């Protein structure tokens, strides 16, 4: 029960993490990363969803990161972009006075794997002489288990209706086409059968 910063995006996962963090700590603030798009539906939904439950939100533009993109160095993939996110989130946690850094990451990409988040935690700590603790509450949970959690927090429906998962700005049960939707839906259904 101290101060916590949640890397928030408004998706099923970061939202569940926030709800989670809200019950674990006294103070909880959020951070949303955008690539120069205060107007994006994702950044907006997130700000909405944040309001809905107190918690200050901080926006951060990470478009400078795109300098490292292949095209800019003369493909749009930039490796270890999660290193930077957690790096920044921890610089922020420092200023804002939080010791805890919640994130929805969960092993795919090497910088989403559990050992990387651990090495990263050590690094930020040495970088700033602060006992920072990075929490990855969804690390060993699958989609259906992520719903299961939300539900154990009593926010199943909140999450179901407000978060943005679809790859087309369509809130909740988006297009019902894209991967995201299928994965989110199959997870939901899988959790319902294990009712």
Q: Does 136 bind Mg ion (CB under 5 A)?
A: no
Mind spelling out the 3-state secondary structure of the chain?
CCEEEEECCCCHHHHHHHHHHHHHCCEEEEEEEECCCCCCHHHHHHHHHHHCCCCCEEEEECHHHHHHCCHHHCCCCCCCHHHHHHHHHHHHHHHHCCCEEECCCCCCCHHHCHHHHHHHHHHHHHHHCCCCEEECCCCCCCHHHHHHHHHHCCCHHHHHHHCCCCCCCCCCCCCCCCHHHHHHHHHHHHHHHCC
11 binds, among Zn ion, Mg ion, none (CB under 5 to 8 A by kind): Mg ion
Q: Of residues 5, 6, 7, 11, which one binds Mg ion by CB under 5 A?
A: 11
When the beta carbons of 11 and 187 are compared against Mg ion, the nearer one is 11
14 binds, among Zn ion, Mg ion, none (CB under 5 to 8 A by kind): Mg ion
Q: How far is the CB of 178 from Zn ion (least distance, A)?
A: 4
When the beta carbons of 12 and 30 are compared against Zn ion, the nearer one is 12
Q: Is 13 assigned a ligand-binding role in the annotation?
A: yes
Q: Is 40 assigned a ligand-binding role in the annotation?
A: no
Q: Of residues 5, 14, 102, 174, which one binds Mg ion by CB under 5 A?
A: 14
Q: Is 8 assigned a ligand-binding role in the annotation?
A: yes
Q: Does 57 bind Mg ion (CB under 5 A)?
A: no
62 binds, among Zn ion, Mg ion, none (CB under 5 to 8 A by kind): none
For binding to Zn ion (CB under 5 A), which residues are involved? 166-168, 174-175, 178, 181
């Amino acid at each position: 029960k101290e101060k916590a910063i949640v890397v928030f995006s408004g998706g099923q996962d970061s939202t569940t993490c926030l709800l989670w963090a809200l019950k674990e700590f006294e103070e909880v603030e959020t951070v949303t990363f955008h690539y120069n798009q205060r107007h994006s539906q994702e950044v907006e939904v997130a700000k909405s969803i944040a309001e809905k439950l107190g918690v200050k939100n901080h926006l951060l533009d990470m478009s400078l990161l795109n300098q490292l993109a292949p095209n800019a160095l003369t493909s749009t993939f930039v490796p270890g972009r999660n290193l930077v996110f957690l790096s920044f989130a921890s610089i922020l946690a420092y200023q804002i006075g939080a010791r805890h850094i919640i994130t929805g990451v969960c092993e795919g990409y090497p910088d989403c794997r559990d050992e990387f988040v651990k090495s990263c935690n050590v690094t930020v700590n040495l970088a700033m002489e602060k006992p920072f603790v990075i929490h990855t509450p969804l690390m060993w949970l699958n989609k259906a288990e992520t719903w299961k959690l939300a539900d154990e927090l009593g926010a199943l429906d909140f999450v179901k209706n407000n978060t943005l998962t679809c790859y087309n700005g369509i809130i909740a049960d988006g297009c019902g086409e894209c991967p995201a939707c299928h994965l989110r839906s199959k997870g939901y259904e899988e959790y319902m059968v294990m009712k």
